[PDB]
Design a protein around this ligand. Sequence first.
Ligand SMILES: [Zn+2]
Ligand SMILES: [Zn+2]
Ligand SMILES: [Zn+2]
Lengths: 53, 1008, 46, 53, 64
Amino acid sequence: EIEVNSSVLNDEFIAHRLGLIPLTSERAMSMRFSRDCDACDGDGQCEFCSVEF
Amino acid sequence: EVDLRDLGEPFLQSFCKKAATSFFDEYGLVSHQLNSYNFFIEHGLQSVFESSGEMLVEPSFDPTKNKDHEWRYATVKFGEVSVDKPTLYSDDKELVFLPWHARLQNMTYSARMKVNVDVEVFVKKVVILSKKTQDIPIGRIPVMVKSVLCNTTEKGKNGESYRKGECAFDQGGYFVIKGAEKVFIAQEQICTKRLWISNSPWTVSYRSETKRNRFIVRLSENQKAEDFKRKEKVLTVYFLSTEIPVWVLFFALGVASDKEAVDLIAFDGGDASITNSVVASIQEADSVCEDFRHGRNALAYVEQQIKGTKFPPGESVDECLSLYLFPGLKSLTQKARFLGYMVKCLFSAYAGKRKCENRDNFRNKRIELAGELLERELRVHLAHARRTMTKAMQRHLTGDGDLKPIEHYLDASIITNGLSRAFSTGAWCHPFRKMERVSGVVANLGRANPLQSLIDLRRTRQQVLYTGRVGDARYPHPSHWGRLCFLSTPDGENCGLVKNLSLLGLVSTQIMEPVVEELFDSGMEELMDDTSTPLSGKHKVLLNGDWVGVCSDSDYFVADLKSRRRQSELPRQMEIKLDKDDKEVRIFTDAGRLLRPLLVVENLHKLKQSKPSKYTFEHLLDQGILELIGIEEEEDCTTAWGTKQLLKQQKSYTHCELDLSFLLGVSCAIVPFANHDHGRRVLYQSQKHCQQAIGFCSTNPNIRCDTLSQQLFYPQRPLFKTMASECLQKDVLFNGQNAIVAVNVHLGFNQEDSIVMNKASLERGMFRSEQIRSYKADVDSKDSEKDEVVQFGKTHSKIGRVDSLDDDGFPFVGANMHSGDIVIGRCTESGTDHSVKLKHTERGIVQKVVLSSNDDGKNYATVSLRQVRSPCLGDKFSSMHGQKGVLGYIEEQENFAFTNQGIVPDIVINPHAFPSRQTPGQLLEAALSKGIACPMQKKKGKSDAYSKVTRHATPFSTPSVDDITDQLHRAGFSRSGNERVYNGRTGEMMRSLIFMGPNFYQRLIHMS
Amino acid sequence: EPVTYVCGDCGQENTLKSGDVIQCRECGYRILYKKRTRRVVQYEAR
Amino acid sequence: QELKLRAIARKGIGKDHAKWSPAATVTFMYEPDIIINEDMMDTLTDDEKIDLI
Amino acid sequence: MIIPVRCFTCGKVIGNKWDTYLDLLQADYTEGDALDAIGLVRYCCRRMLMTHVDLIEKLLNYNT
Ligand SMILES: [Zn+2]
Ligand SMILES: [Zn+2]
Ligand SMILES: [Zn+2]
């Protein structure tokens, strides 16, 4: 979700570069696919999926 | 140093590279457009207006005294013309005017012309405001970008070049006409001021574009064919009528007797047919008039110029008309000699000693750029303005009323509307017949690449005359060598008529500062003032097709003229032509030849003795190491094919070319291995596929409001290098990405010229494009006629879909405009909608909203949508070698064949494409780039191990097979180009070795 | 927020009202971009 | 110029997009069995030895 | 424009290696020695660094 963007790049370029930044995933074998979670239908942070940055 | 070795090939090839990059530093690539427009503004604009003194005879009446011819015959004449820089003429402190204002406001980037007219009508021949007329508005002329009038040129780099109207890729040889970007195409004309020898009626010809009273001499017409007559020379139609025999026009010009007129012609002697022809000429001459008796017995037969003419050439039809033949000649004793020279040329052409004039040999052709075309159009509309003015002066006979001489009669809108319709409609004036129109002139300017603009600014065009044996008008003629391009051309309706100016080509402009007296200092005895016959077999020196003298031992004379030119003592745009067989010297100071520079093989070679680290091009033209050479002069020069080994095998060369890849066009010279492909494939790549590839767009996208701007994300340069791409240093000449290509059979999805990509590579950003489209509308001023008011608003009564529009009538700047919405709310106050709506296939995020206007309030609206596209399963791609396809199958990563390093291809193509289409250049390119990008083992000791690496795939000078294969042996891979893979499904060894390696591919527009 | 249009070379916010001749005040140039207000927008990093 | 946004990470695998694949090189190879003769190698000459090496 | 993260063919992260590449070419190194100094063994990444066109600067100059 972009609130303000006033650079020379565009929104999809920045989102595309953010998608490729590797995050350390050692609790990902114990996390759950977000289509399989009962909670977290609020487009935000959760505890078995959906870490927020 | 006379051996010219010991300063050998790594020095000379380095000098050629430095000279070529200094060439493009000084001249650029739009040099000829700018030079011709600048020359028009500096000289030719004032040169047009000097026409006459504007007499006025006012023929209305003569019954009575108070309407006699007693009101004064007026007089008025033009003086200086002054042209402003273009300003935006608003009241309350007028403003400076820029081309981006003209594009975004839909007006014409034009400047005002002011003329210093003088009028001194004064009553003294009946039976004044020269002052207060300094600045009279006379039309508005448009202005080329980067001209001597455009406001984007006075500051060099970082004073204020950043204005609000710039790109870093733009060089600007275009116009802006009511919001659109126009561009001239170079025309092609015959070289007049030269004798022209036909052969169907044998009619040797003295043309003149000006002075439309000029003649031809025709020998192959007998007037009858009953039994047979001898061929006699009749000096046929002379004043658009009035045939005369040749001998009446001899003794009218004062030849004393015969046997000097035979020595004025001075043919071979013998060859009976010639002397039979001339005695038949005399016998025809005395049959129509008894000539050579008085000063008026022969000159009185020149009589058809009076009444039997249909068009009497002015008043005083007598010896005053003798300055309508040969105005460059000054007295009759030279005009008689030049008539004898014409007849000698005709007789020499009859006996098969002089070949007739081949039209498609480009030394007989002058190219008309923007200067001459503006000359022609402005002369037409100015002549109409003069007639319209003098008809307006006559309505005020014998009563003044409104007499202020200026600003009541001289209407600027005439020339304004004329020059506007010339650019906007394409109704361009024909160069010969001053009533019709021609069309294949000024076009639109492409912007899809920054290479399409370069190709669109460098073009020359042969017209269509009549389709009955055009001859060789669409086939490369050996005079194109080094000047035009013999590989790339369009195909279709105009295949070979539109030609591409080469890299090192240049166009001469004009030579002022007259050079008749400059030739005396090397030879050049002056022409006599009597027939007599003292003229030996000495050579002849013409100047733009004009006898101005006669010299002898011309082998030294032209050597001294070239030596004065190389020491910067004669002007640089002057061709020196020594015809040794016809015994003739031609000197050209002409406007519109084709010039290119060459290495002069000096006998001292200053490069060894001096060696600075800089070479400006003005500096290298002073020492005479380089030299601007035309087409005429070059055929007397034996030029080598490069310093490589070829200027070192002999010393029988007088020049050298810089490098052979500069023979090609701007878009063909950068193709790797370009002399290996079939010619049809290179035509494809260098005319259509380079002009369509998706890549760079601009470096200020906030101002370009045009339909369908497109752009990649990550543009690249190729792994290899060519000569021209290195000397130019524009990485915007390459629009695509370095894909890895493996040739192998896939499951049947890459058949019939179809290609297979990799989904993982597509998901990391590869070939991902981004398009921007603009939607436009308009409404009147504010309230005036100068209801049907369709003022931009909301109209809240829910006509269509208004979820995103604001109160002003336009959406906001983060919207997500859908498949079919309302994009501009152009609705009236009470009636139905006139609002613009999206159609079925346009959608996207709003990028900006631009709202401008015109002088009469015509408010303009601009909305740009943005989209991001990844390449789908229907899109088209191509290599650098005319090898195109359609993406037919997008494959997941773990099913491709992988090498022992784990490398996967990005594009897989079918091996049935190569043995038929004859492009081994793609395989050689893949092997070269694979040998570049790999590391190099055994680097410990004995070398730095990265210095004997070939990166140059220059077209006509290319690396050998042994170089490439020994490089692949040094890099560790197999010498045959192949590579062993394992399968991505069964996992075991595929039996056939696979050819892999990187290749520069391209993505083309018109996606589906 | 209101519309708050921005000029091209002034950079000054004219905050345009109902349709006059399009012309930036404090000058005479006629560019008049539209300012982006403060919203949110959703995107998939794909 | 500024840039305010808020990103939400989730869980996925490499078949949905390339951003979730943690590999960046996974490959294997066989290993050869070379059974070079000694009664043919002593026949041919020393320059031929240093050539075919 | 900017260097792409994730070399398109294999998937190694190269998005941080640009400035050290410019500094190694600035010092005195040729391109082979520079890429062997940063540690890129397979040519799928070497072709991604050697052929990158950096266009962000020309965009930064032409804004206001
Ligand atoms: Zn949850
Ligand atoms: Zn303003
Ligand atoms: Zn890799």
